[PDB]
Coordinates of C-alpha atoms and ligand atoms in Angstrom, one line a residue:
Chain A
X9 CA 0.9 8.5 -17.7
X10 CA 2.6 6.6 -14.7
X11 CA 2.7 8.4 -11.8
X12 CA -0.8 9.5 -11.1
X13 CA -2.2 5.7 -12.7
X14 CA 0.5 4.0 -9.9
X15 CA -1.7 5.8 -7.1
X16 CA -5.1 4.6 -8.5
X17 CA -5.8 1.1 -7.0
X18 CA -5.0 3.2 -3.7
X19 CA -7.7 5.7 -4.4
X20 CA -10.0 3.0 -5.2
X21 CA -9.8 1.2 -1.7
X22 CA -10.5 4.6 -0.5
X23 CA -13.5 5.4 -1.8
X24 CA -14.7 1.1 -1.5
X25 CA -14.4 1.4 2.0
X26 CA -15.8 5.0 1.7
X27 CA -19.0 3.3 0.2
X28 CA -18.5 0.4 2.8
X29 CA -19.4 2.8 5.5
X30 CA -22.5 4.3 4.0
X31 CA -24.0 0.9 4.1
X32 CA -23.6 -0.7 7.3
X33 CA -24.2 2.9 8.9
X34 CA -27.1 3.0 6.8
X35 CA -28.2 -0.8 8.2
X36 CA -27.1 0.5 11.5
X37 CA -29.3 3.9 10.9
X38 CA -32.2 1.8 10.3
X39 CA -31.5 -0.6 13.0
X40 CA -31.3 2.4 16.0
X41 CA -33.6 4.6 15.1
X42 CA -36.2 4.1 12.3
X43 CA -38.9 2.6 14.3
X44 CA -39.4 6.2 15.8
X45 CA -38.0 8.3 12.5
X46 CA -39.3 6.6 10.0
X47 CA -39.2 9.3 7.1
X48 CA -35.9 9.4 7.5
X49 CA -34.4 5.6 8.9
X50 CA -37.3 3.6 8.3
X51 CA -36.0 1.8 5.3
X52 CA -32.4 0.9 4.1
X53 CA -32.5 3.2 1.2
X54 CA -34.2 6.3 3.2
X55 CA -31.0 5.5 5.9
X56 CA -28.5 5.9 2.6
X57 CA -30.2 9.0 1.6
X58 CA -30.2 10.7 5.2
X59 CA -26.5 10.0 5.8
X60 CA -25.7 11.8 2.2
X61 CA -27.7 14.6 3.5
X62 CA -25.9 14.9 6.5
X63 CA -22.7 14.8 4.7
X64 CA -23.4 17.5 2.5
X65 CA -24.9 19.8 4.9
X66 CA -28.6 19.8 3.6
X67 CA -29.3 19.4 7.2
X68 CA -27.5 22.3 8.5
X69 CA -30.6 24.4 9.3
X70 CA -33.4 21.4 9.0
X71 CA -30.7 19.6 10.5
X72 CA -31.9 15.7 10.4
X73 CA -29.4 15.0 13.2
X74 CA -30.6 17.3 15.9
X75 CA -34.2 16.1 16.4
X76 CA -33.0 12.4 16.8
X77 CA -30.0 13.8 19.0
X78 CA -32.7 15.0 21.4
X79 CA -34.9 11.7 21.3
X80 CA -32.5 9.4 22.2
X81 CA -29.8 11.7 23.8
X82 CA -26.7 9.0 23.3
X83 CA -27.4 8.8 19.3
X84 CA -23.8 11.0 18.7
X85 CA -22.3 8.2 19.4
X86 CA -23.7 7.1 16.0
X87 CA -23.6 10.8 14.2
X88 CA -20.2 11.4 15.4
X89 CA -18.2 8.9 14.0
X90 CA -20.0 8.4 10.8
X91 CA -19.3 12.1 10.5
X92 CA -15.7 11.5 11.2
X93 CA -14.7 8.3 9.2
X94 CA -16.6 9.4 6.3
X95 CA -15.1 13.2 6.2
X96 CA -11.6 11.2 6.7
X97 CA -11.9 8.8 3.7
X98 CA -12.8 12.1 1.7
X99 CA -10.1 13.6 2.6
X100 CA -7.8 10.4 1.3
X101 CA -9.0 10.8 -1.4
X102 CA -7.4 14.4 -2.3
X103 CA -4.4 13.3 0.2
X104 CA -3.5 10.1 -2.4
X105 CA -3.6 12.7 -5.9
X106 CA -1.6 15.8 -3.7
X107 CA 1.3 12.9 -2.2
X108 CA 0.7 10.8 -5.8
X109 CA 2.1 14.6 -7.5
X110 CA 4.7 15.7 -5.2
X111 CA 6.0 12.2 -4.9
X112 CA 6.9 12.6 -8.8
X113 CA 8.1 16.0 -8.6
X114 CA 10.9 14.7 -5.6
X115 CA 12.0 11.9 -8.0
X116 CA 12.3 14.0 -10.9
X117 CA 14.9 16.1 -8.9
X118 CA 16.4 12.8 -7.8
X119 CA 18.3 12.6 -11.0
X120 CA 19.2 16.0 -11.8
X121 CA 21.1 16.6 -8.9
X122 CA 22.7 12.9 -9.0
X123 CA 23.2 13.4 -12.9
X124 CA 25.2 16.7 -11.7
X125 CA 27.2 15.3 -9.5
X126 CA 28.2 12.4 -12.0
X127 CA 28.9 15.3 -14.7
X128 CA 31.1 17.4 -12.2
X129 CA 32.9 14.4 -11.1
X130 CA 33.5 13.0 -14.7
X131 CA 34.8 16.6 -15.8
X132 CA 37.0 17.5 -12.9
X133 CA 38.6 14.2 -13.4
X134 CA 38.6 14.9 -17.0
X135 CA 40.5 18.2 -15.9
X136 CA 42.8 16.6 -14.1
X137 CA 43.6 14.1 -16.5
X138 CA 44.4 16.2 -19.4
X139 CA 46.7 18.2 -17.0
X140 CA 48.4 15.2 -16.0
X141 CA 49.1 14.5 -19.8
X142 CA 50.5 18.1 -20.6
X143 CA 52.9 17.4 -17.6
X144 CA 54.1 14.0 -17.9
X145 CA 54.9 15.4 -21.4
X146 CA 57.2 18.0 -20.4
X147 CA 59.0 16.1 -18.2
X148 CA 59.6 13.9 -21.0
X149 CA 61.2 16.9 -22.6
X150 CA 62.9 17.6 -19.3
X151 CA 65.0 14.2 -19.8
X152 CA 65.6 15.2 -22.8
X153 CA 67.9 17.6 -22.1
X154 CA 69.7 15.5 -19.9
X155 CA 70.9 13.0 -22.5
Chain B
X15 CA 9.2 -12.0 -7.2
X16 CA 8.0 -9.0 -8.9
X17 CA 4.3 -9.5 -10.1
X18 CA 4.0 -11.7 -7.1
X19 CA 4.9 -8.6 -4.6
X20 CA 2.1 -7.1 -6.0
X21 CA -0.8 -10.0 -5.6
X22 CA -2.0 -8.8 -1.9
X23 CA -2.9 -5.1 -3.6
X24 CA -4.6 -7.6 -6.5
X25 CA -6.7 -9.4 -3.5
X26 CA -7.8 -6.0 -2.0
X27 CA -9.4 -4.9 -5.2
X28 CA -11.1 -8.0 -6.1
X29 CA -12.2 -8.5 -2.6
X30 CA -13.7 -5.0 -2.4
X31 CA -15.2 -5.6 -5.4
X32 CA -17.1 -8.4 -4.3
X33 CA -18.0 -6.2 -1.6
X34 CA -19.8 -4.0 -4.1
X35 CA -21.7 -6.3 -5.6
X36 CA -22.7 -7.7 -2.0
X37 CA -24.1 -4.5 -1.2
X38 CA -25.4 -3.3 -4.5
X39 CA -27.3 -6.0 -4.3
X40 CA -28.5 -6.1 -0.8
X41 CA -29.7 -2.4 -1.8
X42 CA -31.1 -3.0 -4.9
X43 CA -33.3 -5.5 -3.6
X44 CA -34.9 -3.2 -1.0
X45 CA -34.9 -0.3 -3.7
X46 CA -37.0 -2.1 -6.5
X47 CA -37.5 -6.0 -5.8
X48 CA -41.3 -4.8 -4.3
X49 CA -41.8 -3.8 -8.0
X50 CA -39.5 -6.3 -10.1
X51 CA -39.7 -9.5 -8.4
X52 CA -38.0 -10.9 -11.8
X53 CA -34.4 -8.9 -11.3
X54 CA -34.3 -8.0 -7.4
X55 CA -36.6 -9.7 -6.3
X56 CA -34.2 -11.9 -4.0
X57 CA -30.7 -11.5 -3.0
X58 CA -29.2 -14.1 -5.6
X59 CA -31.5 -12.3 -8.4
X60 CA -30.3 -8.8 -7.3
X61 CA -26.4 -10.2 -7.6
X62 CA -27.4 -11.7 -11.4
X63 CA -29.0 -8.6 -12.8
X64 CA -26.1 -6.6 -11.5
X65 CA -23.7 -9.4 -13.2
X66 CA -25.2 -8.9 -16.4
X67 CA -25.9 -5.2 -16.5
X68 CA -21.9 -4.9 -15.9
X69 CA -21.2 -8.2 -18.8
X70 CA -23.2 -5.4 -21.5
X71 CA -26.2 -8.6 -21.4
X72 CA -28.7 -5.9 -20.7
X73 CA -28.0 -3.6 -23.8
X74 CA -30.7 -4.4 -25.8
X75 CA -32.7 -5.7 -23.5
X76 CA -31.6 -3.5 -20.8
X77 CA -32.2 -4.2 -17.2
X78 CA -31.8 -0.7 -16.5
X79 CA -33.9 1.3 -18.8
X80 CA -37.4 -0.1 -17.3
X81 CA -36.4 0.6 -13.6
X82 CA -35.0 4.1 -14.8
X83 CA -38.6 4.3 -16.4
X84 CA -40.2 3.7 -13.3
X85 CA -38.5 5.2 -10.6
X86 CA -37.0 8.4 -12.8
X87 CA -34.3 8.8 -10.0
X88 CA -33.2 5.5 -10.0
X89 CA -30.0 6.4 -11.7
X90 CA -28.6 7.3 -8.3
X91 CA -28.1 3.5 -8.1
X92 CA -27.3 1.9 -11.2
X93 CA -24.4 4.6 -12.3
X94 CA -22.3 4.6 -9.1
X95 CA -22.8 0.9 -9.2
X96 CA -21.2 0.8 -12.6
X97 CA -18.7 3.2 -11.9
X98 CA -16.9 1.7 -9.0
X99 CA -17.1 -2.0 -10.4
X100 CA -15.5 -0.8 -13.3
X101 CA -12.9 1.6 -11.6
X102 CA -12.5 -1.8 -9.8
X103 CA -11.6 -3.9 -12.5
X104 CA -9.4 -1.7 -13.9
X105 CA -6.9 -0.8 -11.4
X106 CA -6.7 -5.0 -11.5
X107 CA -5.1 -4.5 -15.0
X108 CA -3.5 -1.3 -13.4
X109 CA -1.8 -3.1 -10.8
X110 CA -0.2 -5.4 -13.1
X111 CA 0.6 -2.5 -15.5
X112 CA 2.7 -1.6 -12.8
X113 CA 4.1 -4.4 -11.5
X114 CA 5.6 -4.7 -15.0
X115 CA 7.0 -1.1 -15.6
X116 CA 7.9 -0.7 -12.1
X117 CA 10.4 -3.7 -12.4
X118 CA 11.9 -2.7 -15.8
X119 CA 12.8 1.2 -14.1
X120 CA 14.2 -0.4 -11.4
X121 CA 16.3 -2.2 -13.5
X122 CA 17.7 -0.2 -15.5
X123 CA 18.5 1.8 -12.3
X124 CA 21.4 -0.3 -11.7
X125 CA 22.6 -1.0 -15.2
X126 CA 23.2 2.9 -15.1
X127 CA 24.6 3.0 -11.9
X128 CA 26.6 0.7 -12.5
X129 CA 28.0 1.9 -15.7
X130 CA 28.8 5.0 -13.5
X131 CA 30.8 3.9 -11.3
X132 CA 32.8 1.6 -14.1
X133 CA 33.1 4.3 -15.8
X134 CA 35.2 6.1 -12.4
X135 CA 36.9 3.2 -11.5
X136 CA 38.3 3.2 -15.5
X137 CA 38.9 6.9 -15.7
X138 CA 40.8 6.9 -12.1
X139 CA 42.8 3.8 -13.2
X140 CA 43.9 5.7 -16.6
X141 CA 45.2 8.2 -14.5
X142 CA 46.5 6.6 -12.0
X143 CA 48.8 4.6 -13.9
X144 CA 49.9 7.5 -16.5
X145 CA 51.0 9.1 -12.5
X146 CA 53.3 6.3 -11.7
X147 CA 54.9 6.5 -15.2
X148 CA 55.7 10.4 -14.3
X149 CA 57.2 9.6 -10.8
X150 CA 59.2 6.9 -12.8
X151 CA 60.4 9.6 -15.2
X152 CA 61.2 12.5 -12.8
X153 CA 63.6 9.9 -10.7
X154 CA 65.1 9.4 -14.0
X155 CA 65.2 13.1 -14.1
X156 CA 67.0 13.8 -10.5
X157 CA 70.1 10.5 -11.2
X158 CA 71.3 12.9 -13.8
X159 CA 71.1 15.6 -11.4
X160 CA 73.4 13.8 -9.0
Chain C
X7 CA 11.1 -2.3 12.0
X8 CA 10.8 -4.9 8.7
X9 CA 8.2 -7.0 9.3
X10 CA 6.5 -4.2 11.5
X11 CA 6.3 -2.7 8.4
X12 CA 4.3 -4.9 6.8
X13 CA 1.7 -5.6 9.4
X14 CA -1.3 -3.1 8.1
X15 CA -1.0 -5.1 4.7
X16 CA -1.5 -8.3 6.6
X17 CA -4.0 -6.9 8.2
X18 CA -6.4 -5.5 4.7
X19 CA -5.7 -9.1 3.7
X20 CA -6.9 -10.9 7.1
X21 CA -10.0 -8.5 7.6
X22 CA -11.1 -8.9 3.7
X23 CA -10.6 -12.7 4.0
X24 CA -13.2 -12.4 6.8
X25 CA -15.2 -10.3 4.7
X26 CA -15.3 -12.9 2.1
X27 CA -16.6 -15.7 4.7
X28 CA -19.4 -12.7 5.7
X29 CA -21.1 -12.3 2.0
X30 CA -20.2 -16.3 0.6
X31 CA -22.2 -16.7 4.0
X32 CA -25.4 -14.6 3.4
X33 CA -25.1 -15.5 -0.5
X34 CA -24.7 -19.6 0.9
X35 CA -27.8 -19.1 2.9
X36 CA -30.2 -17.5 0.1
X37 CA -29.0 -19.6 -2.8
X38 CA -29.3 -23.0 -0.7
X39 CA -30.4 -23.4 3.1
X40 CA -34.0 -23.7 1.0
X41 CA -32.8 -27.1 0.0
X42 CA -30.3 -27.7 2.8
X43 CA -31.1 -26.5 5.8
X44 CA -28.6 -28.6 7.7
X45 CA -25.7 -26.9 6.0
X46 CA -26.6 -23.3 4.6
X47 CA -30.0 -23.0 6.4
X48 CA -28.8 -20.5 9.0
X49 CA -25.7 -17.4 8.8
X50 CA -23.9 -19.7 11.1
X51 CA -24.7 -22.9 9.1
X52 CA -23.1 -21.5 6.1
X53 CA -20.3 -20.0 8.1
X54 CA -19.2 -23.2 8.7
X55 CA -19.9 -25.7 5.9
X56 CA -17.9 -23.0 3.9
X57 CA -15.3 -23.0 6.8
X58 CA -15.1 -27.1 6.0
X59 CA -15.1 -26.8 2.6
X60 CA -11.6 -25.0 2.7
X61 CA -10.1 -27.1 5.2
X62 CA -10.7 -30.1 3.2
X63 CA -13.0 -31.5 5.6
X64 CA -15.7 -31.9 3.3
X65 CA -13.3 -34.2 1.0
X66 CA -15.0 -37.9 0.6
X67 CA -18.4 -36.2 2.6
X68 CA -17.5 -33.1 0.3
X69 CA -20.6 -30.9 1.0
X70 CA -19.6 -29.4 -2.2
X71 CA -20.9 -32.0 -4.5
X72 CA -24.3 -32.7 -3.2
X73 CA -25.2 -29.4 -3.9
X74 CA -23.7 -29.2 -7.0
X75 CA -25.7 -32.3 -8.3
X76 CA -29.2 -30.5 -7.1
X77 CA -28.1 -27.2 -8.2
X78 CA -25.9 -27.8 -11.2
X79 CA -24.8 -24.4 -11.7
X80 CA -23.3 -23.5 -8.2
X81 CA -19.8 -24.1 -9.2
X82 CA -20.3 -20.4 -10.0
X83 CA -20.3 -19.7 -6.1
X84 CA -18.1 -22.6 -4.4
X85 CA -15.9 -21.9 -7.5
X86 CA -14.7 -18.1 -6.9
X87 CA -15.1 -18.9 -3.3
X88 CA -12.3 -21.2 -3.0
X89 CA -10.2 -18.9 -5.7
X90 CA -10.7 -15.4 -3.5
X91 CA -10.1 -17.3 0.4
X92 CA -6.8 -19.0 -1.0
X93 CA -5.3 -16.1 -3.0
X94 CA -5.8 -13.7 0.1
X95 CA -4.5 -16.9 2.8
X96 CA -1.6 -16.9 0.2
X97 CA -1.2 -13.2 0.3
X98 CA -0.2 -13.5 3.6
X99 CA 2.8 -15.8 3.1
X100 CA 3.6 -13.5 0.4
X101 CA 3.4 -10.5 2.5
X102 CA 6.1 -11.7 5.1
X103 CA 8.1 -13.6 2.3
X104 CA 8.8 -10.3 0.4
X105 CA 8.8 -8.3 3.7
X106 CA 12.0 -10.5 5.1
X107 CA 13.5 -10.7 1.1
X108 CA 13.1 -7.0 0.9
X109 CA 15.4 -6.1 4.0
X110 CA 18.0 -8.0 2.7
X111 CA 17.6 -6.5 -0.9
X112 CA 18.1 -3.2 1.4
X113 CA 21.1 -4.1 3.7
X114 CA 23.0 -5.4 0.8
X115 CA 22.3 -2.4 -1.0
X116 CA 24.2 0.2 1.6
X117 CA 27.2 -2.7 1.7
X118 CA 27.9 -2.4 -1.7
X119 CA 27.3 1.5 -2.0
X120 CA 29.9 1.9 1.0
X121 CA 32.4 -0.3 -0.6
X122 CA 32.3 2.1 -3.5
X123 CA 32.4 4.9 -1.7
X124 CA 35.6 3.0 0.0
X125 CA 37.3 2.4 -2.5
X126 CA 36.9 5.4 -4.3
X127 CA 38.2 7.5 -0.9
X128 CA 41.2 5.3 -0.7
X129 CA 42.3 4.7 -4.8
X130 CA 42.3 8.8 -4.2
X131 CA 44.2 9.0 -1.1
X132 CA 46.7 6.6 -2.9
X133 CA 46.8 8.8 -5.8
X134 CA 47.4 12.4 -3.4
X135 CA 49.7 11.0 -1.5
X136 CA 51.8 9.8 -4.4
X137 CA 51.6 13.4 -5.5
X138 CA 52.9 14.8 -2.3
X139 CA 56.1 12.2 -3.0
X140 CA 56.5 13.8 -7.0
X141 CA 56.3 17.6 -5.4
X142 CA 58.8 17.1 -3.2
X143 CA 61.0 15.9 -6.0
X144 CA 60.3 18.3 -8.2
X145 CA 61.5 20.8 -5.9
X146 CA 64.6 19.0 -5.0
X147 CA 64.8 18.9 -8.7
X148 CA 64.9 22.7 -9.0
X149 CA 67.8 23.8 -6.2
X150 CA 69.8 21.3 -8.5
X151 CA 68.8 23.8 -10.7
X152 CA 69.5 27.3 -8.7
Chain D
X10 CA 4.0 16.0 4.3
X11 CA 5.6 12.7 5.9
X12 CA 2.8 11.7 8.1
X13 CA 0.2 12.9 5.8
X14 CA 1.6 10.6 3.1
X15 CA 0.5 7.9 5.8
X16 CA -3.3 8.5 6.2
X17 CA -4.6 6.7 3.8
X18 CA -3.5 3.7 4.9
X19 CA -4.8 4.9 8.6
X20 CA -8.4 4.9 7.3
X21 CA -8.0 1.0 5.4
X22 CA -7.0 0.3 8.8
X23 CA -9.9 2.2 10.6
X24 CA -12.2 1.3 8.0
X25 CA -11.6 -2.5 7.7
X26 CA -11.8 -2.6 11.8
X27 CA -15.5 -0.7 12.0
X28 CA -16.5 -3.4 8.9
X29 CA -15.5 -6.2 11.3
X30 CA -17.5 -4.7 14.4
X31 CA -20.0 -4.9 11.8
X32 CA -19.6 -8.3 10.6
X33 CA -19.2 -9.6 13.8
X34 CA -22.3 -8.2 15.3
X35 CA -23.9 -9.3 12.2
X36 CA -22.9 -12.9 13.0
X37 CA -23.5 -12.0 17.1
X38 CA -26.8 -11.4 16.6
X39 CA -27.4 -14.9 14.9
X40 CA -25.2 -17.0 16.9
X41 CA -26.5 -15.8 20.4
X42 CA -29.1 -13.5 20.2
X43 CA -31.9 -16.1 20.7
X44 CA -30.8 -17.3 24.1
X45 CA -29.0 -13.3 24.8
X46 CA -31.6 -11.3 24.2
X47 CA -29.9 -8.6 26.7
X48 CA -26.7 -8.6 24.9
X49 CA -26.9 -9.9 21.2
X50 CA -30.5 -10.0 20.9
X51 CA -30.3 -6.3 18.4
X52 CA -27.6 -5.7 16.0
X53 CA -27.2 -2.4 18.1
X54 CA -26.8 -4.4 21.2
X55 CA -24.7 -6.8 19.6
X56 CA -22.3 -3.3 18.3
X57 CA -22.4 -2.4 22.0
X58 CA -21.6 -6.2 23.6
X59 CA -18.7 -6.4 21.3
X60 CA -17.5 -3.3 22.1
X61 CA -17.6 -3.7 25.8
X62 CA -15.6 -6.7 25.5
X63 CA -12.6 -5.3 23.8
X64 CA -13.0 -2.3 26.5
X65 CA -12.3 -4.9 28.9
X66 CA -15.1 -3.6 30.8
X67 CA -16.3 -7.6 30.3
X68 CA -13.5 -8.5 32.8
X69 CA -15.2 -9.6 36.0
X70 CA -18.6 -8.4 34.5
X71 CA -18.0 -10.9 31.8
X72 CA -20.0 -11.2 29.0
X73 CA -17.7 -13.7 27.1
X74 CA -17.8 -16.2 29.8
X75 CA -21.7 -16.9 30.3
X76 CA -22.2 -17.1 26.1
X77 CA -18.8 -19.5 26.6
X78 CA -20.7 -21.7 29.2
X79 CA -23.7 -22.2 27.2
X80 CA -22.4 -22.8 24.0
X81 CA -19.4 -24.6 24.2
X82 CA -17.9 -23.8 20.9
X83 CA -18.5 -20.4 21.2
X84 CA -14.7 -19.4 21.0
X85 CA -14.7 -19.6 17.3
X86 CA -16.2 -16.4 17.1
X87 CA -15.1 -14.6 20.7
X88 CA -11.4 -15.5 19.7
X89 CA -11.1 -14.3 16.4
X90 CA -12.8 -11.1 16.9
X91 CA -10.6 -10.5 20.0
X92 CA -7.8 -11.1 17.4
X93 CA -8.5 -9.0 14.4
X94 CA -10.0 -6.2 16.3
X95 CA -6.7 -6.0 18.5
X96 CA -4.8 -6.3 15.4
X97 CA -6.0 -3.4 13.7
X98 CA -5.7 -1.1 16.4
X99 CA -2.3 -1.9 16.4
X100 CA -1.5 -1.9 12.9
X101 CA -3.1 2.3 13.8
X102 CA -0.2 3.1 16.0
X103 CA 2.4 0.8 14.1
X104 CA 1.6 3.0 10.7
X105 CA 2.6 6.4 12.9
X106 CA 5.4 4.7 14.3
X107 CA 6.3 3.5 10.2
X108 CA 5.9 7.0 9.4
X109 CA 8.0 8.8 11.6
X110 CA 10.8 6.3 11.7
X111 CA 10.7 6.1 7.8
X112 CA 11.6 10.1 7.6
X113 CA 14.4 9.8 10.0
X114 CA 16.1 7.2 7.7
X115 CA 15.0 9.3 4.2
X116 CA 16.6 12.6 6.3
X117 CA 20.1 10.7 7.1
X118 CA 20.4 9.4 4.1
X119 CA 20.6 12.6 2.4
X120 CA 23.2 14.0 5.0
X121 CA 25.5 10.9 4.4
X122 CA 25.2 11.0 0.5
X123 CA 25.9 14.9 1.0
X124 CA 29.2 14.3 3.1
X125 CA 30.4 12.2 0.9
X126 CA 30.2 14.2 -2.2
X127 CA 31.4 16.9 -0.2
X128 CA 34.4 14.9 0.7
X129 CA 35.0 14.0 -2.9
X130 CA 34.5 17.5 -4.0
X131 CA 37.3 18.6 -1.7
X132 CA 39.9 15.7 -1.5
X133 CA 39.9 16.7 -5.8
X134 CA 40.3 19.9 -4.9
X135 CA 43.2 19.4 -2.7
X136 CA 44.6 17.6 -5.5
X137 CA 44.2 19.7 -8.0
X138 CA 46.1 22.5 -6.4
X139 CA 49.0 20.5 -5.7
X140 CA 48.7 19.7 -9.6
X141 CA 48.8 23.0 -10.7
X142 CA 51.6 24.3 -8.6
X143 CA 53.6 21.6 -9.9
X144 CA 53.1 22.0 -13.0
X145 CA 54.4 25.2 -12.6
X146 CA 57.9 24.5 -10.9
X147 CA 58.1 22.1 -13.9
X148 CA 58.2 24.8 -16.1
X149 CA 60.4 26.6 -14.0
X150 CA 62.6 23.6 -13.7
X151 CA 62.3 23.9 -18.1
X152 CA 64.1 27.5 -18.1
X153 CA 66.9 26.0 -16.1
X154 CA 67.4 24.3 -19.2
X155 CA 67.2 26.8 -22.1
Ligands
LIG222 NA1 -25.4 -7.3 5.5
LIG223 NA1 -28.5 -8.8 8.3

């Protein structure tokens, strides 16, 4: 229903440009480094399948990224922000469904305090009114008397 | 100038999706082209054999199923593939769900707001006017008094 | 702080137009610099003819159609081409046209809230203060009475 | 929860701008490599090259110029890069500035909307009173009469 399928098309650019990055650091993996690694970055798809390993942490005690970290000593300049624009697009991805929630939960209470003010304004003028009435009668009465 | 506020988040979708089949295909032709010249064999033949695995063309005689019988792992391609570019093409139709809905709630936002404040402007007026009628009727009351 | 709003939607727009020069680029140069090396036969070639072919400077030397008489099934390509590049150039007029239309949509929207509330605070401050008035009266009315 | 409703659109922008480094290096390599082997003649040079020049650390050490003196034309593709690139960065800071601006308005216009229901609430209440105790010296002023 409409509140979480609003937030969709957002999600979707998320993870397009989260597959977006994958690729050209995967033709940029291959570019940098596969002529000396190539097991790991010597073709396009081995570059694909190295960066998902170093996302998921299958390289945490093989670690792929620390033996070409100490070839070419510069290469976190590469590992780093892969790392970091990849985690953050992850991350969106959570961020859009927790914000798409709330954000329905805060209009929902929108109305039912602006549907309660409208009610206690219509009935204390409705309280008002009828004791107008009741008075505006006995004064009636009052010049009644005085006939 | 409703749908057409939403035609820039339109563009972003399609253009992504372009996108995937840019690099679907620039992938699938280093993946399998070596071994089916025929489907992936170049870039424009890579784009095509995508195209009509998505079009249901290759459902009988399924584009997939031979490179899944070759490479057994191959599915690590074809199904994100067809998951995005349809996820894609639906939040096109999503969008203009949207567009839609959101214009009729917003709508009908003011219709009821309005009605609201009719409705305060009547209900003061009522009393209002049955107040001057009293004041009118108590200085009636205080000339016989003098 | 209106149109700065709308800036990082102009932006998605302007860097996936670019994107869509990129890939009609590398797909112009496979499916054609073969044949026409002139105009698709290198990444900047194609670049460029497909740079011409929007600005209508390929309209009575229209690169287009020679191509499409050799190949005739590349309307497919300069086809969605032209549709994608002009919906997103058009999706940024859009974006500033509904950005300028939607902050006077919001400034009119307080003006006519705070006339309410105006009037409201002042057809109540004529109705108390015509109270005050009837009291008084009324109490007059009662040493009459004592 | 009011700049974290803003992220995702930080990373479109983010994203998009490493996707034109990208592209443009792409297209750097191509245009210049060939005669700039130093600079363009890798994609990772190319990356780097690009990268310097927005860094402005291409300013009397400047890359830009030499490829601008051989190749004439070669603004087409300096320019535009210079523009997009700059363009996203500052659609990065505009979409914090967005943010926190945007919950300063949503914040006052809760304490405004309060105030005035507030005010209503009371200037009722202050009417109501003075009903009630005249309703009462009414009927006080009514045994006067029996
Ligand atoms: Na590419
Ligand atoms: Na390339």
């Amino acid at each position: 229903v409409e509140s979480l399928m609003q937030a969709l098309p957002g999600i979707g650019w998320t993870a397009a440009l989260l597959l977006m990055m994958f690729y050209i650091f995967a033709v940029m993996g291959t570019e940098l480094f596969g002529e000396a690694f190539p097991q790991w970055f010597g073709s396009l798809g081995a570059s694909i399948y190295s960066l998902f390993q170093i996302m998921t942490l299958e390289s945490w005690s093989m670690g792929i990224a620390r033996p070409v970290m100490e070839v070419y000593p510069l290469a976190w300049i590469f590992f780093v922000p892969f790392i970091l624009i990849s985690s953050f697009m992850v991350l969106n991805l959570f961020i859009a469904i927790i914000v798409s929630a709330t954000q329905e939960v805060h209009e929902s209470e929108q109305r039912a305090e602006r549907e309660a003010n409208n009610l206690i304004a219509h009935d204390e003028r409705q309280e008002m009114l009828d004791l107008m009435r009741a008075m505006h009668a006995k004064i009636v009465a009052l010049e009644q008397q005085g006939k």
